[PDB]
Amino acid sequence: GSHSMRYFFTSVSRPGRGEPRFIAVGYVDDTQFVRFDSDAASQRMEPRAPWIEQEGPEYWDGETRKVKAHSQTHRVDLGTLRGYYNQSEAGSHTVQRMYGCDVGSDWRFLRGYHQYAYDGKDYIALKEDLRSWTAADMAAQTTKHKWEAAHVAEQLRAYLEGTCVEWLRRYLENGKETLQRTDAPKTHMTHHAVSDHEATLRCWALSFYPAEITLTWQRDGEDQTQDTELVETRPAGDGTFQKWAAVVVPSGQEQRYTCHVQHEGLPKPLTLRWE
């Protein structure tokens, strides 16, 4: 019954092909609700969920200003990190920032986060106390020093423990039919021979929300984790998710294998069997 709001921002330098590409998106749990793309015509923060559309002009003007301000900061950051790492003008680099807050079933604060990455790797992140920083190499220590001198953690903490949770609750209320739902997975297993001595057993979960799910195979009750191909949970495109897990088994042994499904919409975890 637990929820989260997260904003994700990516900027990519493109030396000689314009100013950096900037993309921003916001989510409540697994549902996207807003986006911004610097290469789009509108130059506005735009709705991506029907329940956010009701926010008035002040909201959209305000979110547009903020997201443009984020974009400008990341543009500066790209030049700064080049200097910190002594990198050349010519190559393309990526900065990513994500932040947000988590609340429990009662919608009270659990934790917040605010993290940054340069070229695919941790750079700097607020620690769980929201008062100090973890800096992942020496360039990030420079950033820590400047951010500590500027009292950045204090204003981030006021947002993460206050504003962030307050807007999350508002979204959860306004978007309740979409966001407070739980759709339990529809499960089945398929069987296809891959030769006359081996068969693929694939355990499927379809049409579920939220995205979080566990799929496992057992053989005589022993977990088969090293032998299981597990795909990334994937969007169906309609607001729900899909996932499967497969094992290749000697023909004749099917009845030894069971698939186990855990999801918050199930009243009990499921066990699917071949007998």
Binding site: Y59, H70, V76, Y99, Q155, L156, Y159, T163
Partner: peptide, 9 residues
Amino acid sequence: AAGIGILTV
């Protein structure tokens, strides 16, 4: 609603 007071590195 997104944050404010985000600084450059």
